[PDB]
Amino acid sequence: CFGGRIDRIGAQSGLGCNSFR
Amino acid sequence: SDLTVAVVLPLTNTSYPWSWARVGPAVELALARVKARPDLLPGWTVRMVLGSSENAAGVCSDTAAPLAAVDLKWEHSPAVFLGPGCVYSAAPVGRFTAHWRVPLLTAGAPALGIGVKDEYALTTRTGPSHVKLGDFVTALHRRLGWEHQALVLYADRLGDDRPCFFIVEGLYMRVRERLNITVNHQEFVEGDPDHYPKLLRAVRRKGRVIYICSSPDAFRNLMLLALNAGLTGEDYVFFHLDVFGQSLKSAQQKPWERGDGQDRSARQAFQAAKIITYKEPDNPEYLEFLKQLKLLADKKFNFTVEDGLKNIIPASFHDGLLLYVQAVTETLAQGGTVTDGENITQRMWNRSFQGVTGYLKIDRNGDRDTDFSLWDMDPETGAFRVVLNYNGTSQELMAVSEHKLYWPLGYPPPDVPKCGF
Amino acid sequence: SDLTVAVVLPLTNTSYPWSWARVGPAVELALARVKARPDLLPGWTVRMVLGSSENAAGVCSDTAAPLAAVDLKWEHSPAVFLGPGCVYSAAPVGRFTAHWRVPLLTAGAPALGIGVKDEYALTTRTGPSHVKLGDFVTALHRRLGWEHQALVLYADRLGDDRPCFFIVEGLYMRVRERLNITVNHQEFVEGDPDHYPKLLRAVRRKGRVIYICSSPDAFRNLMLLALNAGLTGEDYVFFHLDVFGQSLKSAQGLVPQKPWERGDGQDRSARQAFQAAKIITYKEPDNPEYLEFLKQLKLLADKKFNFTVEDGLKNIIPASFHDGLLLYVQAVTETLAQGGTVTDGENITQRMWNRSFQGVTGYLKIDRNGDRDTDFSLWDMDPETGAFRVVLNYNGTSQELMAVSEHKLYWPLGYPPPDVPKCGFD
Numbered sequence: 054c055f056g057g058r059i060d061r062i063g064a065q066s067g068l069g070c071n072s073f074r
Numbered sequence: 075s076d077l078t079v080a081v082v083l084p085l086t087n088t089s090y091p092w093s094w095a096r097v098g099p100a101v102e103l104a105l106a107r108v109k110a111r112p113d114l115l116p117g118w119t120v121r122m123v124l125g126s127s128e129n130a131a132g133v134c135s136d137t138a139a140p141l142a143a144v145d146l147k148w149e150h151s152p153a154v155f156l157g158p159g160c161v162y163s164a165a166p167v168g169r170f171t172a173h174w175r176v177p178l179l180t181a182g183a184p185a186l187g188i189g190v191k192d193e194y195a196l197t198t199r200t201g202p203s204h205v206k207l208g209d210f211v212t213a214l215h216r217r218l219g220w221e222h223q224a225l226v227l228y229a230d231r232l233g234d235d236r237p238c239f240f241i242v243e244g245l246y247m248r249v250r251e252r253l254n255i256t257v258n259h260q261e262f263v264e265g266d267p268d269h270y271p272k273l274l275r276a277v278r279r280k281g282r283v284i285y286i287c288s289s290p291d292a293f294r295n296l297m298l299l300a301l302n303a304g305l306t307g308e309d310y311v312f313f314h315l316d317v318f319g320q321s322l323k324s325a326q327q328k329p330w331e332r333g334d335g336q337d338r339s340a341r342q343a344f345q346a347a348k349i350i351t352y353k354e355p356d357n358p359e360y361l362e363f364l365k366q367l368k369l370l371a372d373k374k375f376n377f378t379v380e381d382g383l384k385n386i387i388p389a390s391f392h393d394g395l396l397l398y399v400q401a402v403t404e405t406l407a408q409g410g411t412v413t414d415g416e417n418i419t420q421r422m423w424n425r426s427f428q429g430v431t432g433y434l435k436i437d438r439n440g441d442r443d444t445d446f447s448l449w450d451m452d453p454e455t456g457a458f459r460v461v462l463n464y465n466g467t468s469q470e471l472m473a474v475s476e477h478k479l480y481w482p483l484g485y486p487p488p489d490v491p492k493c494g495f
Numbered sequence: 496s497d498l499t500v501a502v503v504l505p506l507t508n509t510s511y512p513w514s515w516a517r518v519g520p521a522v523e524l525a526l527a528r529v530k531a532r533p534d535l536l537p538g539w540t541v542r543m544v545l546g547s548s549e550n551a552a553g554v555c556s557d558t559a560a561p562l563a564a565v566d567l568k569w570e571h572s573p574a575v576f577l578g579p580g581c582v583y584s585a586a587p588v589g590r591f592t593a594h595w596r597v598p599l600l601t602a603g604a605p606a607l608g609i610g611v612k613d614e615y616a617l618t619t620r621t622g623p624s625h626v627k628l629g630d631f632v633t634a635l636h637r638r639l640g641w642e643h644q645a646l647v648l649y650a651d652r653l654g655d656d657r658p659c660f661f662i663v664e665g666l667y668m669r670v671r672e673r674l675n676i677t678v679n680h681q682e683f684v685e686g687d688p689d690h691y692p693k694l695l696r697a698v699r700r701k702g703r704v705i706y707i708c709s710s711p712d713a714f715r716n717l718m719l720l721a722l723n724a725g726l727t728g729e730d731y732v733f734f735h736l737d738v739f740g741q742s743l744k745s746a747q748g749l750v751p752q753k754p755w756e757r758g759d760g761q762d763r764s765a766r767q768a769f770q771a772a773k774i775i776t777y778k779e780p781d782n783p784e785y786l787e788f789l790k791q792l793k794l795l796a797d798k799k800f801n802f803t804v805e806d807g808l809k810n811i812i813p814a815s816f817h818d819g820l821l822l823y824v825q826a827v828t829e830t831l832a833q834g835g836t837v838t839d840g841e842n843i844t845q846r847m848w849n850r851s852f853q854g855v856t857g858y859l860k861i862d863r864n865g866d867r868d869t870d871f872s873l874w875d876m877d878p879e880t881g882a883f884r885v886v887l888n889y890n891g892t893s894q895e896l897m898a899v900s901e902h903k904l905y906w907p908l909g910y911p912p913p914d915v916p917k918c919g920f921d
């Protein structure tokens with residue numbers, strides 16, 4: 054979720070928070 | 075006299091299923107059909123204004139969409155807004171229009187967020203919706219008794235509208251809402267090869283019933299590496315979340331074929347693969363709509379509308395516009411005016427309608443129930459073909475041509491390992 | 496003739512560190528200091544138009560803010576925008592203004608996203624930024640040798656500006672950008688107790704250097720439960736990311752601060768665990784121009800804004816607004832001196848970036864990226880009296896950690912415990 058720079062009308066919440074970059 | 079319809083979609087870029095090249099003609103076909111029915115809008119004439127949702131770069135944007143929305147508000151004082159279809163484009167617009175107290179109709183904006191009552195009041199979704207994919211998954215999961223865990227993999231190219239994230243979000247939240255089971259999730263980057271040893275490990279560690287949302291090529295590669303690792307229909311099952319069927323090709327199925335001498339292993343792998351897409355409307359009116367759409371776009375919109383599952387979006391835009399037109403008519407019959415958003419919207423909700431796409435039901439929440447087809451491989455030929463069908467409204471699953479889903483060990487593999495993960 | 500400034504902030508709700516009740520007087524103070532400087536804006540008098548960022552419910556929204564921005568743009572054709580402060584209010588506005596090619600000034604919008612100037616062109620941030628907090632964290636870890644792991648917990652609802660998510664978001668991204676250390680994150684809901692046996696387990700399993708971003712009451716309860724588990728300074732350390740220092744009371748005159756002070760009987764047990772606790776806040780300006788500014792700010796808000804400005808770190812936001820507007824005026828003036836018009840956003844901005852300035856907050860430096868460097872104080876309790884007091888300071892520009900009033904960081908063992916457990920994680 055912290056892929057940050059997702060502010061893009063970010064209100065779009067949810068959960069999905071896993072990855073690895 | 076004049077029912078102004080504001081349009082906010084991509085007026086120049088034609089890569090989106092909701093581009094004006096694809097949707098314009100379909101809308102023109104809808105207005106025309108309107109003009110021919112005297113039983114719709116007695117004494118009113120529909121007018122249309124156009125605004126682009128795309129920025130200078132040519133992509134649909136969170137800035138241009140809303141800005142164009144305001145221009146059309148001051149210059150035309152519209153009764154209804156059409157589009158946008160991109161999630162990040164529609165979000166702010168749907169929000170403005172909710173404030174303005176004006177109804178908005180779109181066949182795009184499938185994100186879970188847009189479904190929120192109080193935030194997107196007056197927003198009717200006549201196209202597909204991502205939560206609805208959760209319904210189907212829930213239905214599919216119940217049917218084959220997967221009572222515990224599921225793994226979701228998804229990849230989304232950073233410069234875009236995160237198509238696959240919204241898809242997985244809808245599935246994730248709805249499945250958890252209804253089955254309250256454990257849904258593990260993992261995001262990866264397609265182009266990044268570092269993620270593959272991690273994805274595979276992830277599958278082995280936390281998933282048996284797996285849903286992948288990626289490009290057709292990515293799904294191909296993963297299936298290759300899956301078998302290569304000794305993973306098959308024996309204990310694992312792989313679903314490709316390909317909603318618009320990009321891995322296939324409609325109208326006339328080799329999703330595993332690429333012609334690289336990797337098709338032998340591919341097929342063996344694609345034995346554990348099953349493909350989830352939107353259900354193609356098979357009613358006659360649909361077929362006749364496509365041909366008219368093709369011709370009109372080519373002749374007046376300068377574009378060639380190739381055949382494909384993406385065509386349901388402009389067909390849905392078409393039906394939604396007819397659906398709204400009747401509701402306004404219905405509002406007028408009982409005294410209301412055209413600027414009665416609440417009244418008109420509510421007439422459209424929880425209602426079944428007959429459109430070119432056929433049976434379309436708008437739910438209690440303002441969204442079109444979505445039907446989905448589950449493709450599968452032939453134990454004989456190996457070619458993928460619809461084996462299952464889910465009725466969005468009926469929520470029930472029905473087999474097709476008395477087919478049976480392939481399971482290597484007879485009964486579908488358990489959604490849990492022998493001694494635990 | 497006259498330079499129009501557009502303001503988009505909370506004009507009615509007075510609960511935000513950037514509400515008009517607090518910023519208005521600060522801006523008035525600024526326009527006034529302008530009319531008194533003839534070396535600023537020769538042949539130009541600053542005008543001001545107002546728009547609210549809050550919705551019907553009176554909370555700042557991502558719909559009223561941009562909408563008000565669009566309206567002010569049409570009716571007044573401003574050269575510059577002020578605010579908004581809420582992350583979700585600012586995001587669309589800054590985005591609109593960049594398209595419009597108009598500079599934006601704000602001491603709010605601390606979110607990482609705003610940092611991307613390609614999208615947020617012409618947005619100059621004259622207040623704190625959460626990325627900067629990452630710099631501080633990097634600094635702390637370097638000073639105390641932590642090159643492996645850290646655990647961040649954060650609490651936040653879904654229907655708000657999600658302040659604690661954005662804070663952690665900045666820390667997470669900047670720290671991983673600079674130290675490669677594996678950072679574990681866990682979100683929880685304050686009100687729901689289910690998360691508590693979950694959090695402990697996570698603290699017990701995912702980290703030793705723990706950063707908590709929550710309400711002052713939540714950080715308390717967590718520190719209490721940490722004790723019972725047998726987690727103390729020995730092996731664990733707990734940072735409370737309390738940037739605006741909500742856990743402490745301001746203007747005590749000269750007083751040893753009781754962060755946990757609640758008077759429920761658990762105060763002794765509290766203090767025991769509150770030994771592993773260290774509190775991170777923004778640094779309060781030391782310069783005398785600040786103190787004198789607050790006095791004027793207070794009087795003017797009480798006098799014409801009908802509000803009572805209390806004391807506290809939240810006051811640097813309106814102080815940063817004051818400074819930012821002055822910083823902008825110098826730049827416009829410079830632009831004019833070299834034959835540039837007032838609507839030359841691109842230029843005015845670059846005149847403001849990578850520059851230092853003396854404002855009421857003292858030394859402020861806007862970086863190459865367009866964001867004011869942020870200073871942070873690290874509070875700690877007195878091993879002998881237990882009352883928390885600033886023991887460390889971090890320069891935003893110099894990025895250096897320097898002790899305060901001859902204090903040294905408290906360590907039970909004498910040294911900081913490693914970001915790695917005594918033996919292994921299994």
Ligand SMILES: *[C@@H]1O[C@H](CO)[C@@H](O[C@@H]2O[C@H](CO)[C@@H](O)[C@H](O)[C@H]2NC(C)=O)[C@H](O)[C@H]1NC(C)=O
Nearest residue numbers: 086087088089090130131132133134231233234
């Ligand atoms: C039309 O839209 C497509 C996206 O649907 C654009 O292609 C993308 O362009 C962006 C930058 O504009 C790239 O970073 C993406 O990788 C592209 N996506 C795809 C699918 O290739 C395209 O540029 C637009 N066409 C124009 C030039 O108007």
Ligand SMILES: *[C@@H]1O[C@H](CO)[C@@H](O[C@@H]2O[C@H](CO)[C@@H](O)[C@H](O)[C@H]2NC(C)=O)[C@H](O)[C@H]1NC(C)=O
Nearest residue numbers: 425426432433434435464465466467468469470
């Ligand atoms: C999916 O199932 C629903 C069942 O609710 C079908 O809707 C019914 O369709 C029949 C015939 O078209 C009508 O007589 C009923 O009025 C409908 N019921 C409701 C509640 O609307 C729907 O048609 C099915 N879709 C398909 C084509 O499979």
Ligand SMILES: *[C@@H]1O[C@H](CO)[C@@H](O[C@@H]2O[C@H](CO)[C@@H](O)[C@H](O)[C@H]2NC(C)=O)[C@H](O)[C@H]1NC(C)=O
Nearest residue numbers: 507508509510511549551552553554555654655
């Ligand atoms: C002023 O703003 C605050 C937020 O800073 C509002 O308080 C919130 O109100 C919402 C509903 O609007 C509640 O769900 C939150 O719990 C409240 N937050 C806090 C911190 O209490 C407040 O309502 C606004 N005042 C008015 C009436 O304009």
Ligand SMILES: *[C@@H]1O[C@H](CO)[C@@H](O[C@@H]2O[C@H](CO)[C@@H](O)[C@H](O)[C@H]2NC(C)=O)[C@H](O)[C@H]1NC(C)=O
Nearest residue numbers: 850851857858859860889890891892893894895
């Ligand atoms: C933080 O560190 C920087 C050093 O880079 C200080 O800025 C310098 O301050 C001196 C004296 O005020 C000036 O002569 C220089 O112009 C400054 N240098 C730069 C690079 O701008 C800054 O003052 C320090 N902050 C404090 C007050 O601790």
Ligand SMILES: [Cl-]
Nearest residue numbers: 134158159160
């Ligand atoms: Cl769009």
Ligand SMILES: [Cl-]
Nearest residue numbers: 548579580581
């Ligand atoms: Cl604001």
